[PDB]
Structure formats: structure tokens, C-alpha cells
Design an enzyme around this catalytic site. Structure first.
Site, PDB file in Angstrom:
ATOM      1  N   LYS A 161       0.839  -1.200   0.000  1.00 38.53           N
ATOM      2  CA  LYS A 161       0.000   0.000   0.000  1.00 38.53           C
ATOM      3  C   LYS A 161       0.875   1.251   0.000  1.00 38.53           C
ATOM      4  O   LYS A 161       0.828   2.068   0.910  1.00 38.53           O
ATOM      5  CB  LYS A 161      -0.921  -0.010   1.215  1.00 38.53           C
ATOM      6  CG  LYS A 161      -1.788  -1.262   1.316  1.00 38.53           C
ATOM      7  CD  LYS A 161      -2.953  -1.223   0.350  1.00 38.53           C
ATOM      8  CE  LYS A 161      -3.948  -2.345   0.619  1.00 38.53           C
ATOM      9  NZ  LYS A 161      -4.927  -2.433  -0.485  1.00 38.53           N
ATOM     10  N   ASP A 193     -10.820  -3.697  11.552  1.00 41.79           N
ATOM     11  CA  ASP A 193     -11.796  -4.716  11.161  1.00 41.79           C
ATOM     12  C   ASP A 193     -11.223  -6.104  11.429  1.00 41.79           C
ATOM     13  O   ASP A 193     -10.916  -6.864  10.498  1.00 41.79           O
ATOM     14  CB  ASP A 193     -12.261  -4.558   9.711  1.00 41.79           C
ATOM     15  CG  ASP A 193     -11.127  -4.269   8.737  1.00 41.79           C
ATOM     16  OD1 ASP A 193      -9.940  -4.275   9.136  1.00 41.79           O
ATOM     17  OD2 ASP A 193     -11.442  -4.025   7.552  1.00 41.79           O
ATOM     18  N   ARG A 205      -6.396  -4.259 -10.131  1.00 44.52           N
ATOM     19  CA  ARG A 205      -5.200  -3.565  -9.681  1.00 44.52           C
ATOM     20  C   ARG A 205      -4.077  -3.684 -10.707  1.00 44.52           C
ATOM     21  O   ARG A 205      -4.000  -4.670 -11.451  1.00 44.52           O
ATOM     22  CB  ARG A 205      -4.740  -4.140  -8.345  1.00 44.52           C
ATOM     23  CG  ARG A 205      -5.816  -4.087  -7.266  1.00 44.52           C
ATOM     24  CD  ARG A 205      -5.223  -4.474  -5.943  1.00 44.52           C
ATOM     25  NE  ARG A 205      -6.176  -4.415  -4.842  1.00 44.52           N
ATOM     26  CZ  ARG A 205      -6.363  -3.337  -4.089  1.00 44.52           C
ATOM     27  NH1 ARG A 205      -5.715  -2.212  -4.323  1.00 44.52           N
ATOM     28  NH2 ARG A 205      -7.212  -3.400  -3.066  1.00 44.52           N
TER      29      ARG A 205
END
EC number: 2.3.2.10
Lengths: 337, 5
Positions: A36, A108, A211
Site C-alpha cells: 500500500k 476490522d 489492480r
DNA sequence: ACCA
């Protein structure tokens, strides 16, 4: 404390905790920040009285249309999140490290939904997003909240993938192999190119987004061949299907996949069989096939994954939001009302 | 946008 | 059929 990303000794100590914890997640590894690379990393941890790490949270900060950042700890933190007093302490360290730059810290974790846990989190001041947003579908939350997970500890003596399944499923899995499908695996540029061909072909077939290759190149650079493995199914020199699996903590996770157009001879089932075999061969507790939208034959994700996961899908607690700027939170997040 | 990951 |  906050982790100094420029101190290799501190980074190694953090990584050792992450890799050895039963709560470890690849998306909480520091290598995930390299994947990321458009997000800003901020990482915090807590220590016991002897200075050993006991809890850690890897955060990534992203942009919004406001002056504030979105802070996100994907499938974190790494600790028992039902120990909410300890969770509060780690979240407080994370909030200190954010220094007022984010409007929310969202996490999460892969812990089951329950009424009692949802109520406790709300009692502690968090805003939760789960059954109250379910009507918005799979993408109500960033990661799917309903997941098809194969618990291999139910089969302590299983030697091969077929040992986990009823006869009717054994036949489904045997079929691609009988028809000449063969699977190899690796984590080199060659297998990545094969994956990317099938992945872009799948995405074009479904009209969905996908992606760029550099995303997977960063992932291959960050994770070695004992952690990331690309499985490639072929029949007589023809490329048919692929998948990427990541082994980390207690699970091997089927993350990305695709098939070429035309006849594929059930090659995706052969890929699954080999990915499961990797889990058995490494004594891994869980094989996670990832998200579904609903436990219904109307959901084609569920139909496919139910071939391999006969138990009920795991339903997680969803998104846990530590609200930091409530005005911006209200503008950018809907509560499902 | 779409499966997370 | 999809087999993400």
C-alpha cells in the site's frame, strides 16, 4: 509506543511479534505498507512489564476530500480484541501517534460477530458497522464481513485435500486432474506474469475493477516464497487458471485469482486443491477462501466457495471505528439508518 | 473497488 | 454460467 520505521532492531522486534502471534495477519505485517505504497504508515504497540511486545497495530493513513486523513488498521489489531480494556490501551497509543491528523481510526479484526461483543464495543465508545449496514451488500465494509473459512483442525489426520471432503466433492476435485490439468507454484516474475494474464482476463469478463501489475510486484518483493505463493494451472501447455495465496499466522488465505477465456477444465478446483494441500503440508489451522455477499445459492461467490467450505461462513464483527473528528465522520460515513 | 485485499 |  510508536514504532520508528528507521530503526531496524525495533522493526525486527515488531515483526517477530507479528509473525509469531496467533492473531497475526498479513495485512498487519509491515510489508503490507510496502504494498500500500500510496498510504502513510503509522505503527504502535504495547509492552508487558518485562518489555516484551504484547499487542500491536499497523495503521495506514489515506487521503479524503477533507483536511483529515482516514486511518485504517486492516484486519488489526494483533491481539485478542475481545480483551477490550487492553484494546482501549492500544487504541489510545494509536490515537496519540495520529496526532489529530485523522478523523477516524478504523479496524476490522477477524473476530466473530456477537451481540455481547458489539454491545461492549459500543459501551466503550466505538461506533460499529456490521449488521446495521448489511443491507448495503458486500461492499458496505471495506473487507467482506462474511467469509468462507475451512477449519483444518477438524481433520487432524488428513494427509491430502481429498481427505476433507465427502465423496461427491472428491469427484469434483478429481475431475480437472483426470482431464490433464497440472498445477505448479512459485513466487517469481514468471508466475506473476501468468497470474496477471488470468486476473486481467477475469476482470474484463466481469466488467469489474482490477489492480495494476505493480501492486502484485510490490507484494512479491515484500513477501518471500514461504509466505506468498502463486499457483498456476495448465493443461498441455495452455494456461488456464491461477491464484495467489498468502500464508501468515494461523491461515493460508486465497486472495486473488483468475481464469482465461474458453474451456478451463475446472482448473480453479485444481488450484484450490493445491492451495489446501499447502495448508495441510504446513500444519496450518485455517484455509480462508475469502468473502461472499450472502449465504445463498443466488450468490455465485457462495456457490463456488461452498464446494470447499461446507460449514457456515464466519461472520465477523465488521468495522470498529474510534471516532476522532465527529463532524468529518458524519460527512464521510453513513451508519445504515 | 470490485474484493478489498 | 459464473467458478472472482
Amino acid at each position: 509506543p510508536v514504532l520508528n520505521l528507521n530503526d531496524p532492531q525495533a522493526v525486527e522486534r515488531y515483526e517477530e511479534f507479528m509473525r509469531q502471534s496467533p492473531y497475526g495477519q498479513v495485512t498487519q505485517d509491515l510489508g503490507w505498507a510496502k504494498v500500500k505504497n500510496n498510504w502513510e504508515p503509522v505503527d504502535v504497540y504495547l509492552e508487558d512489564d518485562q518489555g516484551a511486545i504484547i499487542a500491536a497495530m499497523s495503521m495506514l493513513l489515506g487521503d479524503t476530500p477533507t483536511d483529515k486523513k482516514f486511518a485504517y488498521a486492516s484486519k488489526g489489531p494483533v491481539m485478542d480484541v475481545t480483551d477490550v480494556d487492553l484494546l482501549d490501551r492500544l487504541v489510545d497509543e494509536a490515537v496519540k501517534a495520529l496526532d489529530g491528523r485523522a478523523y477516524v481510526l478504523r479496524f476490522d479484526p477477524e473476530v466473530a460477530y456477537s451481540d455481547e461483543f458489539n454491545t461492549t464495543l459500543q459501551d466503550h465508545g466505538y461506533v460499529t458497522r456490521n449488521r446495521n449496514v448489511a443491507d448495503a451488500g458486500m461492499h458496505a465494509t471495506i473487507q467482506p464481513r462474511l467469509n468462507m473459512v475451512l477449519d483444518l483442525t477438524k481433520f487432524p489426520d488428513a494427509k491430502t485435500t481429498l481427505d476433507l471432503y465427502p465423496s461427491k466433492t472428491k469427484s469434483k476435485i478429481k475431475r480437472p486432474f483426470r482431464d490433464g490439468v497440472e498445477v505448479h507454484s512459485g513466487n517469481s516474475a514468471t508466475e506473476l506474469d501468468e497470474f496477471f494474464k488470468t486476473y486481467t482476463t477475469m476482470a474484463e469478463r466481469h466488467g469489474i475493477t482490477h489492480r495494476p501489475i505493480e501492486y502484485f510486484q510490490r507484494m512479491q518483493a515484500a513477501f518471500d516464497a514461504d509466505t506468498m505463493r502463486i499457483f498456476v494451472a495448465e493443461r498441455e501447455g495452455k494456461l488456464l487458471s491461477t491464484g495467489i495465496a498468502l500464508k501468515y499466522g494461523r491461515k493460508i488465505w486465497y486472495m486473488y485469482a483468475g481464469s482465461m477465456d474458453g474451456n478451463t477444465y475446472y482448473a480453479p478446483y485444481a488450484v484450490q486443491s493445491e492451495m489446501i494441500q499447502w495448508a495441510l503440508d504446513t500444519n496450518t489451522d485455517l484455509y480462508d477462501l475469502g468473502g461472499i455477499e450472502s449465504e445463498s445459492t443466488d450468490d455465485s461467490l457462495y456457490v463456488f466457495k461452498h464446494v470447499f467450505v461446507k460449514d457456515a461462513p464466519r461472520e465477523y464483527i465488521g468495522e470498529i471505528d474510534k471516532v476522532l473528528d465527529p463532524e468529518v465522520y458524519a460527512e464521510l460515513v453513513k451508519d445504515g439508518h | 473497488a470490485x474484493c478489498x485485499x
